């Protein structure tokens with residue numbers, strides 16, 4: 001590994017997609033990759049051996065689905081524009097509108113697509129712009145709408161989906177039986193250890209039998225969950241009261257959700273002792289060595305955390321940030337002109353494959 | 368002016384940029400300090416030649432910024448990194464006039480590959496910070512052979528005043544004083560909000576001039592934000608307007624992808640002809656007046672939290688109206704994203720003749736070739 005690099009493990013992605021395929025086969029639901037979280041171009045054909053297509057937020061994702069996967073394309077945007085709707089309609093099997101005005105504006109340009117409406121389920125979200133509330137369905141012509149859609153969950157359980165479906169059916173139930181399909185969105189933490197997979201299958205099966213509809217699920221995170229790591233090197237080690245490792249990667253540019261959320265990444269063969277925000281998480285044990293892990297941007301707060309290792313770090317050691325393929329790459333930056341981590345794939349034969357190697361132009365042509 | 372443009376777009380105004388640069392050139396003129404653009408915050412490719420009319424060069428964090436400085440400006444190049452790497456030091460050395468190291472180890476490791484460059488060390492001034500990895504603390508200078516070192520560097524400020532640089536200089540001279548006289552230059556870093564209304568320019572000039580004279584050193588300043596301050600806006604359109612208790616305008620831009628610092632810091636952008644009533648985080652800022660209309664302005668990503676804030680306007684918004692987010696050229700473009708495949712704002716220049724030029728028009732490949 002020339003560093004930094006995001007490295008997706010084929011074997012792990014395959015195990016995730018096997019489980020998701022199993023959910024679809026046992027429940028009758030169709031499972032789609034939500035590209036927002038996980039769009040790893042080197043793995044799109046692999047994902048497509050298992051899943052039915054992509055869910056896409058607009059033109060660029062729809063184009064990406066077409067090019068990389070070429071399976072079903074489902075497109076939802078809070079904001080379709082006039083200049084893009086034609087190409088989106090040419091590519092998309094399903095198009096979900098966020099408002100009735102959007103539906104009405106674009107219905108005549110989407111006559112070959114199966115149309116849906118996003119439903120605001122209003123379930124603990126106040127003042128959300130996403131979806132249509134139930135009261136606004138009264139009096140509206142739904143003859144041209146074949147699907148209802150919701151997305152209401154983030155890193156959640158089968159029990160949470162049950163709770164959402166209960167409210168979805170109480171508020172929207174009069175309009176469900178007349179649809180061909182319903183899309184339960186994403187946020188289902190299906191490949192996480194301990195998730196109640198049998199419950200999800202039963203919920204999807206039971207709903208489909210109850211209303212005679214095709215169920216769709218559109219996980220993003222669950223596809224990329226624990227499928228790979230960001231690998232960095234120790235470039236320098238300095239002392240300022242604590243021992244501090246400066247790495248060739250950056251929180252802010254390469255793991256931006258660690259700063260936004262905020263959260264602290266786990267590190268292979270290490271334990272988190274304290275967060276960058278100085279929250280104490282654990283105490284150092286015997287025969288452990290504490291380091292601040294820090295990044296290569298010029299920012300004062302480019303700090304991953306304080307971590308306990310069981311050996312001393314040396315310049316040139318590799319640090320492995322765990323579970324860094326979803327909601328990372330898709331949102332990363334070239335801030336401060338920091339060299340981007342290459343995208344790599346560890347294939348089923350344990351051979352490392354370069355998928356994208358970035359260069360100066362990735363930075364210069366974006367400024 | 369804005370009506371025929373594809374939105375969204377960041378629009379830099381030449382006249383405003385030139386006013387800032389005139390002022391920074393005035394500081395250099397009067398103090399003898401040499402002023403550099405810190406590319407971290409402002410790297411607008413279409414403006415680099417304009418900035419070079421006024422400033423002496425660029426401060427760069429590494430290889431990619433040094434190459435950009437070389438290509439776009441072709442003036443002095445000053446490189447500092449907390450973490451130089453072996454695979455890049457060669458090319459950084461061929462491009463840079465000054466190289467500033469973050470630690471003695473990094474200096475000792477790369478001294479022999481940097482013989483044609485002027486070498487500096489970054490000083491941790493330790494002032495109001497704890498556990499900072501940036502710079503060397505004064506105690507670690509003691510009894511170190513500094514023969515090969517021609518400059519000292521600090522960067523200790525953010526959006527600050529001439530009085531705050533005065534307080535930092537006092538601490539810097541107190542702690543590192545005994546080694547300043549032997550240097551050829553000192554670099555006072557960035558964070559000087561020189562072009563903000565009210566800044567005490569006169570005092571900055573005196574501080575720089577006195578310091579220069581006292582120690583017999585060439586002083587360097589390396590503002591980023593100051594160069595870009597109030598030079599331009601991000602222009603978006605209202606794509607849809609919906610209601611959920613409040614009126615909500617959904618725009619073709621995203622706080623998360625296009626104004627990331629609004630989410631990270633967090634802070635709320637001002638909007639042309641509007642007043643902030645409340646932040647995305649529900650902080651009350653002001654009350655609606657009698658003849659105004661309140662709207663939540665929100666983005667086009669699929670995230671629930673892609674909300675800019677609640678703002679008061681003098682008239683109702685309509686689909687197709689342009690929303691102008693004020694002061695969006697610095698610490699924006701340089702750190703924006705194609706998250707959710709959102710179409711990037713184009714980069715445009717409103718030039719000195721009031722003509723709008725396209726600098727960069729983005730496309731699908733800017734997204735697909737990054738995933």
Ligand SMILES: *Cc1c(COP(=O)(O)O)cnc(C)c1O
Pocket residue numbers: 034036037055076151153154155185186187188218219220221222669670
């Ligand atoms: C984000 C999103 C998804 C995927 O959510 P995950 O948490 O990654 O599973 C699915 N559908 C829509 C409409 C989304 O906005």
Ligand SMILES: *Cc1c(COP(=O)(O)O)cnc(C)c1O
Pocket residue numbers: 298299405407408426447522524525526556557558559589590591592593
């Ligand atoms: C960020 C930075 C600057 C510029 O800072 P501004 O606040 O944009 O003026 C200059 N030098 C160094 C070393 C920096 O990290």
Ligand SMILES: NCCCNCCCN
Pocket residue numbers: 299408525526558592628698
């Ligand atoms: N005035 C700039 C402060 C330094 N860094 C800011 C980085 C956040 N965009």
